[PDB]
Amino acid sequence: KGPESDIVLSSRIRLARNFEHIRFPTRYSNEEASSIIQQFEDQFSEQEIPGIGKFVLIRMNDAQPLEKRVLVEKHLISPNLTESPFGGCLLSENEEVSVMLNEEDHIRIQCLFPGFQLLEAMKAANQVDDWIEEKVDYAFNEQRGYLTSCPTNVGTGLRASVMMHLPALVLTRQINRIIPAINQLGLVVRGIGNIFQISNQITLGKSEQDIVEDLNSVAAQLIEQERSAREAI
Amino acid sequence: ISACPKCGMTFQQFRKIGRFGCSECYKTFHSNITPILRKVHSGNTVHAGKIPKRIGGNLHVRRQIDMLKKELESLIHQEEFENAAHVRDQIRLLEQSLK
Numbered sequence: 001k002g003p004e005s006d007i008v009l010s011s012r013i014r015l016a017r018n019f020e021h022i023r024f025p026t027r028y029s030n031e032e033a034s035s036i037i038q039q040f041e042d043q044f045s046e047q048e049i050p051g052i053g054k055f056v057l058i059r060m061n062d063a064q065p066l067e068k069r070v071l072v073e074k075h076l077i078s079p080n081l082t083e084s085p086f087g088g089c090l091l092s093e094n095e096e097v098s099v100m101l102n103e104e105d106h107i108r109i110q111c112l113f114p115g116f117q118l119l120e121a122m123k124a125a126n127q128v129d130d131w132i133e134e135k136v137d138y139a140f141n142e143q144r145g146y147l148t149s150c151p152t153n154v155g156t157g158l159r160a161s162v163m164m165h166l167p168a169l170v171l172t173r174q175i176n177r178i179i180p181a182i183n184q185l186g187l188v189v190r191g192i193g194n195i196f197q198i199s200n201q202i203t204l205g206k207s208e209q210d211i212v213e214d215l216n217s218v219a220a221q222l223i224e225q226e227r228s229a230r231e232a233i
Numbered sequence: 234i235s236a237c238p239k240c241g242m243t244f245q246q247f248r249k250i251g252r253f254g255c256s257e258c259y260k261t262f263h264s265n266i267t268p269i270l271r272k273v274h275s276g277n278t279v280h281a282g283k284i285p286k287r288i289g290g291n292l293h294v295r296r297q298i299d300m301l302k303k304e305l306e307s308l309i310h311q312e313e314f315e316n317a318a319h320v321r322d323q324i325r326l327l328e329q330s331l332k
């Protein structure tokens with residue numbers, strides 16, 4: 001389902017966070033890793049956030065390998081995590097919002113929603129973020145923002161993405177000229193059979209509200225152009 | 234030629250690996266990261282977005298503290314010492330409030 005169930009398959013929001021006082025996963029010890037996941041189990045594992053629901057912590061060590069398979073194929077976790085002995089996934093019973101632990105960064109909040117619903121997803125990622133942040137001193141700095149392992153994520157720590165099925169735009173050959181237009185607007189589109197994924201190119205400089213607004217405007221224009229081209233053929 | 238006092242990384246190590254080791258690498262490679270940020274974020278180098286709720290107090294305070302330390306410097310220069318005693322005690326008050 002979702003608002004534009006026909007055009008956009010999903011809207012994703014991803015917030016990378018790190019503990020201030022714990023080394024990042026590039027340098028941290030196993031004790032530090034197990035302690036992060038233990039802190040999450042103790043103060044979030046069976047807790048609710050109203051509107052979003054009950055969270056439950058799935059630790060990798062205790063998961064069935066086929067259970068790991070299912071989480072991977074639902075995009076709740078990246079493959080590297082399945083063989084990590086310390087990674088985790090705090091899932092809502094809804095399953096739309098997940099919190100990956102001990103991967104590239106200490107924390108990665110994910111909101112995967114089905115339709116064209118970027119700003120709802122953003123709102124939920126923010127709720128989750130605020131909820132975690134009342135128990136976790138985040139790695140933050142006034143000039144740089146939210147501090148991340150890779151330099152490509154520093155600042156808002158936010159990756160926003162939208163999945164789109166544009167058969168008519170590809171068929172009407174418009175796709176060719178649209179792609180450079182998308183790239184000059186500071187968005188990266190990677191094609192992944194007529195499925196494309198647009199997402200924000202940068203994470204530092206803009207604000208999150210504006211990152212999501214920019215992506216949202218562009219997606220909406222693509223939705224209108226696709227409905228037009230489909231009405232044409 | 235520095236290394237991070239928290240996770241030990243050097244800037245050459247950072248060049249090879251491509252990832253920061255801990256939170257403090259950011260402070261101890263501040264200068265060198267700015268060219269990298271510029272390349273990666275279309276010339277942007279300063280954050281213009283969210284601030285977490287609990288800590289936002291702390292950082293507001295620290296900004297005040299730095300503004301008053303600069304004002305204190307200027308006040309000492311002018312030989313305006315009663316004002317300087319005030320500013321010193323205010324800085325001390327805000328720093329106590331942090332911890």
Ligand SMILES: [Zn+2]
Nearest residue numbers: 237240255258
């Ligand atoms: Zn470090």
